[PDB]
Design a protein around this ligand. Sequence first.
Ligand SMILES: [Mg+2]
Ligand SMILES: [Mg+2]
Ligand SMILES: [Mg+2]
Ligand SMILES: [Mg+2]
Ligand SMILES: [Mg+2]
Ligand SMILES: [Mg+2]
Ligand SMILES: [Mg+2]
Ligand SMILES: [Mg+2]
Ligand SMILES: [Mg+2]
Ligand SMILES: [Mg+2]
Ligand SMILES: [Mg+2]
Lengths: 98, 206, 79, 114, 96, 151, 127
Amino acid sequence: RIRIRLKAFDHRLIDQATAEIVETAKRTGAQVRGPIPLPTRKERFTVLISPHVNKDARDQYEIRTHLRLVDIVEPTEKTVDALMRLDLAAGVDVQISL
Amino acid sequence: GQKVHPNGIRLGIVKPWNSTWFANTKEFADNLDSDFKVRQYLTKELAKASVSRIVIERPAKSIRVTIHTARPGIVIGKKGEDVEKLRKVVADIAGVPAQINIAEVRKPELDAKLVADSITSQLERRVMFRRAMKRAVQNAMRLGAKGIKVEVSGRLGGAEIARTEWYREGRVPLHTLRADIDYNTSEAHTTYGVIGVKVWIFKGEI
Amino acid sequence: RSLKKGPFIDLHLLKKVEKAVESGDKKPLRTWSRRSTIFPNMIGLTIAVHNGRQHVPVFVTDEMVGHKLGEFAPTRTYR
Amino acid sequence: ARIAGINIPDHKHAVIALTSIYGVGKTRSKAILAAAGIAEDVKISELSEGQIDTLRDEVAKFVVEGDLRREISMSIKRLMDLGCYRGLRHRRGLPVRGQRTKTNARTRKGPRKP
Amino acid sequence: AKQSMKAREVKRVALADKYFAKRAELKAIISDVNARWNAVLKLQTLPRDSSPSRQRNRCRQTGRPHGFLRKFGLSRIKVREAAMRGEIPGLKKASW
Amino acid sequence: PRRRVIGQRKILPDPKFGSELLAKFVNILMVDGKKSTAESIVYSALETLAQRSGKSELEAFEVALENVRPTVEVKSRRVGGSTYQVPVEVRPVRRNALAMRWIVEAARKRGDKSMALRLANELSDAAENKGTAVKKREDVHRMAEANKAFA
Amino acid sequence: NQYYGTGRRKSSAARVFIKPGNGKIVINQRSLEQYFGRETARMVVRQPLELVDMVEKLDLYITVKGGGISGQAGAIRHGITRALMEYDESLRSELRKAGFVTRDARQVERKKVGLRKARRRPQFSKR
RNA sequence: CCGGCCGGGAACUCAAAGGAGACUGCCAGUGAUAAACUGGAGGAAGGUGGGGAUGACGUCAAGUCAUCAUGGCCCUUACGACCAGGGCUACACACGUGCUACAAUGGCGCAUACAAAGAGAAGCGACCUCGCGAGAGCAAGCGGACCUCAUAAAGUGCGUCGUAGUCCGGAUUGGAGUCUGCAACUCGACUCCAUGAAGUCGGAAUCGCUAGUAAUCGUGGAUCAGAAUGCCACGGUGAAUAC
Ligand SMILES: [Mg+2]
Ligand SMILES: [Mg+2]
Ligand SMILES: [Mg+2]
Ligand SMILES: [Mg+2]
Ligand SMILES: [Mg+2]
Ligand SMILES: [Mg+2]
Ligand SMILES: [Mg+2]
Ligand SMILES: [Mg+2]
Ligand SMILES: [Mg+2]
Ligand SMILES: [Mg+2]
Ligand SMILES: [Mg+2]
């Protein structure tokens, strides 16, 4: 009925508002198709390192972007107030709809 | 040149990040500029307020901004006073609403950046560069600090021809990733030119 | 050779072409418009084509048509 | 086995022997044996007189050979006459399309010397 | 990187949308099979910087038109300067 | 090879005979990394050999190989001024690596149509030592012996 | 029950299900041939049935993806020995000495800024 | 509807978190009963398992005042600033780095099998339809393990070419076109049709690489309206040799 996408660059954290959310579901209402991992779109930016000349220097950075699914099948008005008003983790992107 | 920046090589572990928000490409850009626009402005204001760090998080249509300082009261002003007129301009820059925390800095002698700036502002004050490094390194070992080093660069005192000079008292494993190292920069804008400061401070491990 | 959907030509040159069609030619005719495609209605005229340093006289004809004004105004002096 | 051009080709598959004409390259030849009712890979053995001259017309359709040559010079001359960039280019022995001449213009500039 | 070169780029984006995207889509359909009256294209006398592709793309902090990166909006030189102060969320020296 | 003396990765003895040896052959004749086409060429050059000699397969290559096998070689030795083209005697282990190489190397420089063929014609000619490879050994020989003086 | 082993090689992933029936073999819902029997490695697939006989003693339906001709057939090769699992460890010792047990971990080594391709170095001249 | 497609299935492949695991520790010889090496066991992995990142005090007044910053210097109705057009793309040459070849381990037609890794809203754009084609019109899905970019190529199968400046090789030029963009003359990329140079494997001399490497085959990306033989990534097939 409701599934929540989670994205955030911090791995030791995304699954710790995943757990928090899964927990504030299984304790209230219930169901929840566990929390699903889901491929980590990781960019990469490789840049020239010397301000002038020396194209063999180069720094190589990446930005990992982590996913989490959740999926709650049974939507109890109560389990739908568990997410509401109890949430935080100001650095996870949470998508509620599809 | 050839030493990997000590803070950045640690981010993944044992070292934070002074911006922590999520954005997607599209806005990722405009936020990044917002950030280096609020720190720019702020650092010019709390200039002589001993601010060592300003963290940023945009919590969904919101910007939080902590200001790790070592003179909380001077930042805060007469009960809530200045923090307000900051809030104002900060929300009046980021283009969204601005809350604003003011974390305090104990044992600032231990703070890389505040250290550097100290030496940095002492050079513009016109004091012996030898003496000022020696002070740094001391009050630091003084209050703990398993190590520290501080070098300064060029025109040191004035010389037509430019030098450096470090001062490694204690432990500093810049190869040991676990090692807690608070590293930083500060440039002093003297009348004979510009001297660059770099302080490493070895706090711990694990 | 590109274009496909409307030969190009600047207005402020084209209205220099008609201030001499009706009127009848004058001396040369200065343009910095090496862009424009030469049109049938330019034959017999003498547009001056800027090539960088100054404007080169060029008498149009019945086959300098699908060619840019600037094809007849060498830009790099080589010798 | 002349066809069309002073040229007198054959002794292999037809679709290649046809290209022999100045005026044909693969496509126009495929179109030829196709639009004249012949099989690409057939030699001129088996290919009796009847089939040959049917082709001769099929190629006679285009401006091949001598005329093509004549017509191609015609063009190059036109350019040069108008004193345009691509014309002053043909005249000056260097390459027309835009290629660099700071180095490697050789095939149009001609084997080097001084 | 030379004020006046920035100030151009600002004017370039200003105009880039004052007109184009809007006014210059009296041009979008205008040049497609609605055929014809050629006064349709002729119109292009609109400033010049009015076109988007007339915008370079500058290290939002410094100016450098070279070594830009869209994600960040900066030149690799500032990208790394921020990179090593945290500054860029999620961005660390990667390996694999 | 300065300090860490080493061994040998042992390849997978031939997918159509069960032979370490020939699988060195194919690798050796293999090019641009096309094992597929590579064995295709020895199996069908061994197929023209095969019947044309009649003497089986395995053991027919083994003779032509036995021919262009080299017993001694001239090893450089640049000492003060002098080259010193020292003859010396070679291991069995490579003695057929070479031989296989000089064969593969020869047939590549032949004037026939197909590499299968060229290869075959080389195996054949060598069997009755009169080929380019045999010609090689009869110079690695002529070139030892002429500096045989040394020892 | 379906007795089985995974097995993979170089980005390939083949799963192998044994069942005592015949000597018929199906990879990706395909004849052994119809996939690559008649190709470079048609014979390695059988291999894990050397000292462990069959001819038509036990059946294997298997699927594999990722990598290529040799890589996939490598995985399979693993998964058969890995499924010979079930039938004891009194066979998984000459599966050792044969080597089919081992996971060949050779991967493709990345392209490293400053070289052409992992090890290939851009040619240099002193002047 | 023989499409994992609908129920279902939680097994397996994978997915991203967390753990375990390899330590010369075990046997054995070698070695001063040391360090270590060597070989064997077991094991997915043996002897820093494979790769990355990480570059000490320092050397070259080495590079960067043009990324930015800045001491001094100098111009200020000009060394600043606006617009146009042109130039950085020139061309007797010389050198460096690369791409494409000289060919049957190949060319070519046809059929056909097997990857990885990434990108995407002012975006990726299916489908359908039009066009020989580049493309064009229309139009669904997808902020994306869903949708699109996207139909890997080597390979394998038949077939043809028969050692030839060739059905090898594609330069150069003619003509006609497509898309981007106010704008493709200078100077964009691509496409159709014709054109078919040099080149038959390269003097002296000289570079790379020790294994999933070299060699070879395709794929993607950053910059970017457009403009990759470069650059940064990605798997496929897959060697030779070290006294
Ligand atoms: Mg050259
Ligand atoms: Mg400036
Ligand atoms: Mg641009
Ligand atoms: Mg590779
Ligand atoms: Mg210097
Ligand atoms: Mg210097
Ligand atoms: Mg200044
Ligand atoms: Mg330039
Ligand atoms: Mg060809
Ligand atoms: Mg070659
Ligand atoms: Mg090495």
